[PDB]
Structure 1
Amino acid sequence: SMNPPPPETSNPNKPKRQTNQLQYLLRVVLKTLWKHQFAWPFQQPVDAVKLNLPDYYKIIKTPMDMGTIKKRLENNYYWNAQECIQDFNTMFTNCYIYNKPGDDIVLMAEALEKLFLQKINELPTE
């Protein structure tokens, strides 16, 4: 199997804005996660070809990753903070669906997700 195309990151037909929450999501949340020691599995789409995971996109129908999220933020692709938060949650969920408890990658996801949730608890006002 081929990899699916990556998620769209730009769309001139989708309205754009910058909000304090979206700024925080890029500058604090994304950037903090991105530099973490456990970020590497999550910095780009899962390359099921390169990793020889033929079933990955048979199981995961809503792929998402931080590279995509970063580009969406940088492109002002999101209108609502919740769209971005949802993308992060989808990314984590995919990991938990595909992988098993105690797998290194699941422990990595848990740790990154705990940091993510901590940071979104600090989202500034609307």
Structure 2
Amino acid sequence: SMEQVAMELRLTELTRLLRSVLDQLQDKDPARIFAQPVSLKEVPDYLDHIKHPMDFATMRKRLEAQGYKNLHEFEEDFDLIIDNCMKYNARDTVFYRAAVRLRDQGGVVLRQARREVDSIG
């Protein structure tokens, strides 16, 4: 149908916008602490601590299969990255501090994206 194609043109454009948002968020992690999943070879107890791991590369695979239906879903995955890190690592670590910074710098980009998704559809 023609409705199905229009729905898909919108999913496609949401995906173009989220790819831009992803790049902006990742630029706020110059250290690359959140680029890849936590290694189970290197932290074999990790899944005892964190039930839903997340990282930028996993978000990117989902993004490119157009698996984000809306911005809420995307934001949930971004928050897992931050929130997982702040639980696993103690306050006085480079990892915890890197998450705090990504959250704060993330908040601006996400504030504007919610306006662009509301505005443009």
Which category describes the TM-score, using the shorter chain as reference length? 0.7 to 0.9
Secondary structure at the counterpart of residue 112 of structure 2 = coil
Determine the C-alpha separation between the residues in 2 that align with 1:71 and 1:39.
21
Q: How does 1:99-118 map to 2 (within 5 A)?
A: 99-118=89-108
Q: How does 1:87-102 map to 2 (within 5 A)?
A: 87-102=77-92
Decide which structure has greater helix share: 2
Determine the C-alpha separation between the residues in 1 that align with 2:82 and 2:102.
9
Determine the C-alpha separation between the residues in 2 that align with 1:73 and 1:23.
9
Instruction: Tell me the amino acid that sits aligned with residue 104 of structure 1.
Output: V
Tell me if the contact between 2:52 and 2:80 (Cα under 8 Å) persists in the aligned partners: yes
CA shift, 1:121, in A, is: 0.4
Q: Superposition RMSD on alpha carbons, in Å?
A: 2.0
Q: What percent identity do the matched residue pairs reach?
A: 31
Identify the match of residue 68 of structure 2 among 71, 78, 82.
78
CA shift, 1:25, in A, is: 2.3
1:66 matches 2:49? no
Tell me if the contact between 1:64 and 1:91 (Cα under 8 Å) persists in the aligned partners: yes
Give the equivalent residue in structure 1 for 2:4. none
CA offset digits 1:4-48 (Å, max 9, x no partner): xxxxxxxxxxxx72344x433211x21022234545121111112
CA shift, 1:103, in A, is: 0.7
Tell me if the contact between 2:90 and 2:96 (Cα under 8 Å) persists in the aligned partners: yes
State the structure with bigger RCO (CA 8 A, min sep 6), 1 or 2: 1
TM-score after normalising by structure 1: 0.75
Show structure 2 runs of 5+ residues with no match: 1-7
Tell me if the contact between 1:39 and 1:112 (Cα under 8 Å) persists in the aligned partners: no
Identify the match of residue 25 of structure 1 among 14, 18, 43.
18
Decide which structure has the larger Cα Rg and report it.
2
Determine the C-alpha separation between the residues in 2 that align with 1:84 and 1:90.
10
Instruction: Tell me the amino acid that sits aligned with residue 18 of structure 1.
Output: T
Determine the C-alpha separation between the residues in 2 that align with 1:24 and 1:87.
16
Show structure 1 runs of 5+ residues with no match: 1-15
